[PDB]
Each structure stands twice: as C-alpha cells, then as structure tokens.
Amino acid sequence: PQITLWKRPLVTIRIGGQLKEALLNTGADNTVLEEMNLPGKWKPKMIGGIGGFIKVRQYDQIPIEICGHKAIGTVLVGPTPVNIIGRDLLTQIGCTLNF
Amino acid sequence: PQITLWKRPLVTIRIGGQLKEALLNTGADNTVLEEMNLPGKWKPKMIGGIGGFIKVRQYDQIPIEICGHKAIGTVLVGPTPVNIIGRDLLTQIGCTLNF
Amino acid sequence: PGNFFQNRP
C-alpha cells in the first residue's frame, strides 16, 4: 500500500504465531519489540532513543510477517514504549519514503 | 523523490537562513531540533520515547524548507541527540510510506 | 510518548 502519515503508521505484525501492533519507523535503525520470550541465542545490547538508553536482547534470523510480507532478520527485545519496525526490516519488505 | 532506507534518511533543512541536517522520522509525531534561538513565544513541553522523556520548548508558525519543500508549523527545540523531522512536517511535504 | 527515534548499539 501507500500509507499516509496523518496518523501513526501502525501495522499488524506476526511473530512466533503472535499478533502484535507495530509502528513503521524510518527513524529507527533496528526493529525493537516489547518484552517477550523468543527462542534461541541472544546477546545483550544498549540502544539509544530520544530520552536516553535502554537495555535489549538481540536475537538474529528471526522470522516475522509485517502487513503481509515475510521477513527474516534481527529483532531487539526490551522496554520500548511501542513495537517498532526499523530500517533493517523496512528495506526487506520494499518500503520507501516518497514525497 | 523516492527515499530508500538502506541508510538513515538524512536531509538538509533550512530554517531562518541556517542549514541543518535532519532525520526523516515516521516514528515521531512532532519535529524536534537541537537548541536554536527561534523567534516568538514558546511553551514548555515534555516529549518521550525510548529511554524516557526530555523537556523542550515549543514554537509555532515556524517556516522551514525540507529538501526543497516549504513547510510552516510547530517546531520543538531541545536536547534531542539528532535533528528529527516528524509526521507533522512530513505530511506537509507530501510524504507517504510505500511498499 | 511520541518520538521513537532509535540508534543502533
């Protein structure tokens, strides 16, 4: 689709069989999901935001479906206020910003 | 233009004759720039995201040119780590997300 | 909250 920015660009994503709401976010380098359990190996990382830094767990090569499109890539999990699809996954599903 | 997301979508802005570099951020409701003296009355505001909240000064009716497009609106000014164009102004320049 | 800027590790 083409998505207006008059409202937040929220989409439904599916990960590990769960449905979540996530924000398509060109201002995020990575995809960051609210605290949740994922299988497999992970590494701790610190990420920065508008207000400071948070601790996250980095999981690699995780399948996710984003508003119809299969992607497989890295997911950070931690105390984000909203689920965020960042540029790493936006590029995988073919998303551009157009004006 | 059609902006791909392989790298951060950083653009030149012009505001009161000053050239700055800013990030096109579909995950920001509002535009927030690094401290700058702007003309007119301002009100204190708190804006939040990953890492918590920061205090800013809200100015209104501020003209700003983003990649050749003219806008006018609310600009927040504060200790953001990076200059951020949010949806308020991305809408004015006609921006959509496309995939 | 309304500004979801995020910087890689």
CB contacts, 8 Å: B28 with chain A: 27
Kindly report the nearest CA distance between residue B18 and chain C, in angstroms: 23
Contacts of A71 (CB under 8 A, 6+ apart): A63, A64, A65, A89, A92, A93
Contact at CB, C7 and B28, closer than 8 angstroms: no
| Structural determination approach | X-ray
Cβ burial A7-24 (10 Å sphere, 16+ → b, else e): ebbebebebeeeebebbb
Q: Which chain A residues touch B47 with a CB distance below 8 Å?
A: 50
Burial class (CB in 10 A: 0-12, 13-18, 19+), B95: buried
H or E element, residue A16: none
| Other CB atoms within 10 Å distance of the CB of residue A54 | 20
Q: For residue A81, give the nearest of B4, B49, B84 by CB distance.
A: B49
Domain map (residue ranges) of chain B = 1-99
Q: How far apart are CA C6 and CA A13, in angstroms?
A: 19
Q: Say which CATH topology domain B1-99 has.
A: Cathepsin D, subunit A; domain 1 (2.40.70)
To one decimal place, what's the resolution in Å? Answer: 1.9
Distances (CA, A) of A78 to A63, A84, A91, A99: 18, 11, 22, 33
Q: What DSSP string runs through B77-90?
A: ES--SS-EE-HHHH
- The DSSP code for A51 is T
CA A85 to CA A78: how far, in whole Å?
14
Q: Which residue has the tokens 């920065």?
A: A48
With the CA atoms of B54, B60, B62 and B66 taken in that order, what torsion angle do they form, in degrees rounded to the nearest 10?
Answer: 50
CA atoms within 13 A on the CB side of A16: 10
Distance CA B79, CA A52 (A): 11
